[model samples]
Target: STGSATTTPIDSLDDAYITPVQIGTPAQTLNLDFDTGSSDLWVFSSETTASEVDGQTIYTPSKSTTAKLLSGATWSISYGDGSSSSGDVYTDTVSVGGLTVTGQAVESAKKVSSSFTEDSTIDGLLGLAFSTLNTVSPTQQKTFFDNAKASLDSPVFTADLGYHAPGTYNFGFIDTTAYTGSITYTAVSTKQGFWEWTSTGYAVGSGTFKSTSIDGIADTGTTLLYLPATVVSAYWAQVSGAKSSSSVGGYVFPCSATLPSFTFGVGSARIVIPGDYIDFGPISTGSSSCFGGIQSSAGIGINIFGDVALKAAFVVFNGATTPTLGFASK
Candidate 1:
């Protein structure tokens, strides 16, 4: 299986900002994407009409005798890309690692398009990054984590990325058993549900990005690490003959293959990501080209670190400890 392309240190303060359990649930379990950029719990359900795309594996009401949907409630989610889907809301007796929450709010999309329809592998996404980012909200509903705090053994929802590296995006409470490292803590602000913190900057090999620059936020909803144009240009400059190739939505580098090791640090620890993670696909398979570790997102509202970035470490989200995110090792 492939792995995420990047990694970030989750300070204890930053965990409360996330939605909840974006990955790592057992095969048949239902979970959501812990996103701050958006809020929504979309799943493929059995009740869906045959014509429906069945986005993923939505928990079928028939399968779970405990699932329940709030009456007279419907949801519509609109992405920044101008895509939208509407559906009815339901409450289920949901189960995570060591917690069970009754009447957990989830969405079943009746209408969908190419964005989610084409991908059929994982169950669904729970947007834990932001409360406002959710697709369903009727007069103050508890975010996944908000409800999780009341039921789970711990107040945090950490991310153990890489389960979906080569393909699928895993969701559910993180399995602490997969990693063994000192869990560091950091504080976050409540206003922003996701971990919105200042990064020291970028680094290629041993070189460090200037301290004056403020990179971007750590987002689970996004799929890539967006960097300033100058930073992108500078990083590429070191790869001998590496040149940007024209590709679909992201920048591609296909040249002498002089891949350089990229590393960045939060506090004392440093995260090293390989060039292959930047683009998981092989050039021999197709000419799509490998993804560069960083991309140009100068005008974009917030640059995304993506799943590739988080796979390198054990991310323990400390949502229970008042505005913070926690990090460990795997």
Candidate 2:
């Protein structure tokens, strides 16, 4: 069995994307960020107070007769960025598009951070990482993908993100039409609960490939692309008046300048992120200076291939056996 779901950017910057999900018996809909970097399916809900909640929608577990409270269970999680939420647990029937998982663990937030409240686009985060990363206590819970693996025609899912356009998250089978050329496959490490892998290196504009291997994770939850300083500097070097700023943070360039395309190798395949996509929104509204989508990951100590990178290609998260990741130009 296979199913598909659509996700759209919350803003023009494509900084984040949200997908609609149906939770519980009556299927209360919530737009959630399908985060590959995280592993818990937490949501704003009846337990969340008005002070802690913003304009976003909340899931009412009490309204769904099928929802069952998981006794003695609780969870709390903090993000890489400064946002966190914690609360009680319940088991309910959750479905994304046509893929359905009954008795899926759902965490309802009792409290949320200011950062989460500030963003009104998403009601919650749906993690797609390994089950080991799940934050449930007493008994760890499986991811929605993991729970649906049994009925899937093939043990894989695909991500087809777009620039200023809606994309799809397909489960159980690969949609050949979503990508171009043959996909390049690579193995990943799940020990740290991320789809971590090594890249064959990159290029700036038409420059030569560095032939270096860089370790990073493919994170759909994140907004930007973060790489080592050297790699990041090389791209910024191609643009005039581009410089790293302490005040503005990371690298910024004049809005008037056109950016060069960035290319990274995946085995023998090369995926290019258009220069236009790299041009993140302005540092400030109506400001001539703009923040770049690609930045130095040095501070974080790990390269992160976020929406800026993932949106350029068709990505596959294979879970049939040893977890593997595949990418194809679209």
Candidate 3:
């Protein structure tokens, strides 16, 4: 059995993507960010603090007959951006698209950061990474993908992020109509918790594809693409009047600058990110300075192929006996 769900960008920046998920026996539908960077399914619930709640929807376990407290269980997770949330746990019937998983761990947030409260569009996060990264302690719980794998046609899921339009999260099987050309499959290094892989270098605009091994993770939770400082320097050099600004916290250039396209190869498949996609947006409202979508990963510790790169192609997270990632031009 398979299920398909529509995921739409939350803002013009395409900062994050949201998909509707139903939890509890009463089927409370909440919009959640399907983050592939972590392994925890947490939500804003009645258990959360009022001030931390803001305008996001809350999951009420008291109203669901099927909801059971995971006695003595607790969990917490932090993001790279410094935002965090922690809470107790509950097992309930959780469904996304047409796939339903009984006894799914529904983390009930007890506390959340100000960054989370400010972003009212996101009610919670459904982690899609491997269970090894689960934040639950004493007895770690499985991820939504791991729990749902047994029920899928093929133990896999696909992410197709759009520039601004709606994309799809296909579970169980690949959607033939969702991509074009041949799918290029690559090996996934599982030693780490991430869906990590090494890319076959990249090219700036019409420049030649440089040959190098760039290790990175395909993270949907992240908003921008980060690469080696050298690589980013090369790309930014091509743009007129661009510089990594201290005040802006990243590479900034003129809003009207002509951005060249960015291309990266995955198993010989050259996926190109259109020029406009890298323009990102103005540094500030009505400001002539703009922020670049691609930035240096020096401070990040590891290179990341975030939404900036993922939006350019169709991605498959294969959870088969031997895990692998499949990429295709869409």
Candidate 4:
């Protein structure tokens, strides 16, 4: 059945978008971050220690009659920002909005890093990436989307992420009214288990468009746009008083700097990122230096078109054959 959910951004961090999800037989509600970058649906659970779980809600499989443990199964994950979690596995009914998937793998975390435990707002992560990337011992488990895709009219989900606002995540159908202009389609190379695509080129604030093909992944969970070191350096150079801060570990610029608009190629379409969006808030309260939303993906290996870039356009995560990405101005 077709369904949709509202995803709300936490604070003005532009860090992640959380959507309400139901798990278990009685349907315990949890606010989960619908992540496209990773492929494992994990949550804080009763299995987690008291000290490790902060104020976030936990899913207790034992309380649900429908919950079934995948014997000897376990899962562990580490993100680019060093956030990590390890847990046991259980099959339970998981639902997003009105769309329900029975026997979906719901990893229950027993251990979590400070990054996750401290973030009381996010209870778990609902992975929307390819199922092959799922983390489970012996056999990889299917994500909620994977289990529900077959019953859907079309294997597609549209991410309408917003900046400092709530947006919609529509499944099985594209809401034409949600976007303007034509949705330009691009082939996604999922060899890396991500919605990866190469941009034809880019331009900085009406500057010459450089035809340097840049390969990157569209990640809803990540906060900023991470590009190659060279590309990040070039963009920061145009800003007055911008510098790579050793303490900050990224380029920081004066908050008053008149930032230039950045554009990227998506097939023939060019998506522009506003200048003010680049100033990712202050480095610290009352600080003149502001952390940039676009940073270098040096150690990360691949560039990430995170919320900073994704929110600028309407993106369709096509789960159909070959998996394509369609973008339009939102």
Candidate 5:
């Protein structure tokens, strides 16, 4: 991810490359979430006027030069978060990193739930994370990996995120110089259409969970790193001089201080997040409030690696097979 501006950043495997893709032929430029957790590239459109997408990016088929609508094709999808959105289908020329993929499938949603409309920076999601959902599929089967495989160069995705302003979120080909030479590949298995895996546990400095501290899937749809309260507390406790301070609803710690290396252990392979990640604390935005790590959230359901954690490893979602997972780093 570190090179010329041409080099893509890997923040979340979901956002490995925040490519500019067209939603409809008339071309509406949208900052798509190249997620592997789910399939389908959807964007908010004019039809969904009920909810206001103030700061988010949306698609305008009417503005695209080379697009066509399915006319009758429409869809609505429900995420694990209980959030939902519905829209019509349109064919368009989708571009990523200057690579052109024409006649690509996309969704032009008009009816998005208020929760989704209110709390997102994107118009809609471009699910490259994983899953078999497509508006143009014969059996309703198609993942982004299935469509973008030809253009991925190496058929791999990596992530790198910013804990601070100087940090970057990048993806695509991963550089191995960033870490110790180590790699562990996981086989894929599918339940329904989602690719599933079990992470062994997490290790922070001297703290390591003997049990499955966190056993959940990594998703890009989620923006925050959702963890179990018990695991969150245990990990935070390992932070050097991590004192509770006033920040957001989560623990606000000092930014200048360094945090312990937190690693996600999958089998024998581990991804160590550098101490600079502690700088993820609050940023000064014309205010005196300091940022913090470890936010407080209630559900123990499925934990998401999101942008925060995805930035750490080279992630690959092998959807062509039975949906396996592979990780490598630069």
Candidate 6:
């Protein structure tokens, strides 16, 4: 059966999105980030330390009759941006939208780092990555998608991520009405446990497109677009007062600076991110400087096309055959 869910930005101008997911027998709902970069459906739960929970909701497995302890199973994970969490494992019925997956592995957090605990808005993370990346000890766990894909009409999902607005995540089927224009398809290399692809080329503003290949990941959990240092430098070069600020820790420009548009090649089609979308919020809200949404991913090894880039188009996470990414203007 086909199913879909809605996600909304935590704030009008927030970078991360949150959606509701129900876990356990009686169905305890939690607002979670649909993270495509990692694979582990973890949540703040009764096992979480009382001091670590802050104002977030916690899922108490003891209350769910269907919750079964995996008997000594444990899990721990670390994120690229330094966020981390660790916990015990349980098998229970988990549902998203109207679709339910029985015996889904739900990791209940016993400990969470400061970054996760302080982010009270998100109760947990629902990883949509390949099951091979799952962190449970002994036997690996299967992702909700893996468990439910066989029953779907099509093993595909669509992400209609939005900026300062509501977006829909469709599963089991593609909703053709959500986007316009023919979708440009590209082959995805999942060897790195990410939706990795090589962008044929790119250009800044109305400048000529370059033929250089750029390898990067489409990460829903991340908030910014990361590119090569040289490419980032070239993009900011067009702005009048942009500079790499040691204090700001990234390229920053005057709030009034007219940013340039960014274009990425997808096969024969070009996906363009409007100039204004490149100017993330001010460095600190009241500051006169604004941080560039596209930053250098030099130290990070792999470039990342995070929410900033994904929001510019309608993305299809096709899990069928040679898994691919389909993109089109929203």
**Per-residue lDDT of 1-330 in model 3, one digit per residue for the tens?**
888899999999899999999999789999999998999999999999998988999999999999999999999999888999999999999988999999999999999999999999999999998899999987899988899999999999999999988999989999889899989999998787899999998999999999888999999999999999999999999999999998999999899889999999896878999988887788889999999999999998989999999999999999998999999999
Q: Which stretches of candidate 4 lie over 4 Å from their true place?
A: none
lDDT (tens digit, per residue) of candidate 4 on 1-330: 888999999778777889999999899999999999999999999999789988999999999989999999999999989999998999999889899999998999999999998899999999988888898987899877789899988999999998788999988999999989999999899898998989888888878888889999989989999998988888988998999998988999998888998898998898999987787878989998989988999979999999889999999999987799999987
Please give the range of 10 consecutive residues that has the lowest summed lDDT in model 3: 275-284
Candidate number with the higher lDDT (3 or 6): 3
Ten-residue region with minimum lDDT total, candidate 4? 9-18
lDDT (C-alpha, whole model) for all candidates: 0.55, 0.93, 0.93, 0.90, 0.57, 0.89
Between the candidate structures 2 and 4, which one is better when assessed by lDDT?
2
lDDT of 5 by residue, 1-330 (tens): 111112233332222344455444554677665555677778877666744576676677777787787766767787766777777787777765444556766777777777757745555666765444554433353444455555555555443433332222223344565434565667654553454566777777666545474555656455446677766677667655555554445655555556666677667677766655434534555433344444434553556666556556655544444445666554
**CA error at residue 71 for candidate 3, angstroms:** 0.4
Candidate 1 error regions (>4 Å): 1-37, 47-49, 62-64, 80-83, 163-181, 213-215, 244-247, 255-258, 282-285, 328-330
Write candidate 6's Cα lDDT for 112-171 as tens digits: 999988888999999888888999998899988888999888998778888778898888
- Candidate 2 lDDT trough over 10 residues, lowest sum: 48-57
Q: Give RMSD (Å) of candidate 6 vs. truth.
A: 1.1
Cα lDDT of model 1 by residue, 1-330, tens digit: 111112222221121111223222222464344454556766666655557564465656655555566777788777655656677877765544334555677676677656656555434556666564455656435666666665455555666655333212222344556667666565555464557655455577567645534445566666566766777787778766456655445555663365665655554455666655565343445663555656777667655555556655666556555656555556
Q: Please give, for residues 1-330, the per-residue lDDT of candidate 2 as tens digits.
A: 888999999998998999999999799999999999999999999899789888899999999989999999999999988789999999999999898999999999999999998998899999998999999998999999999999999999888898999999999999888888999999899989899999998999988888999999999999999999999998999999999999988999999999999999899899999999999868999999999999999999789999999999999999877999999999
Task: Give the C-alpha miss distance for residue 250 in model 3, angstroms.
Answer: 0.6
Measured against the true structure, the TM-scores of the candidates, in listed sequence, are: 0.76, 0.99, 0.99, 0.98, 0.72, 0.97
- The positional error of residue 271 in candidate 4, measured at the CA in angstroms, is 0.7
Q: Rank the candidates by lDDT, best first.
A: 2, 3, 4, 6, 5, 1
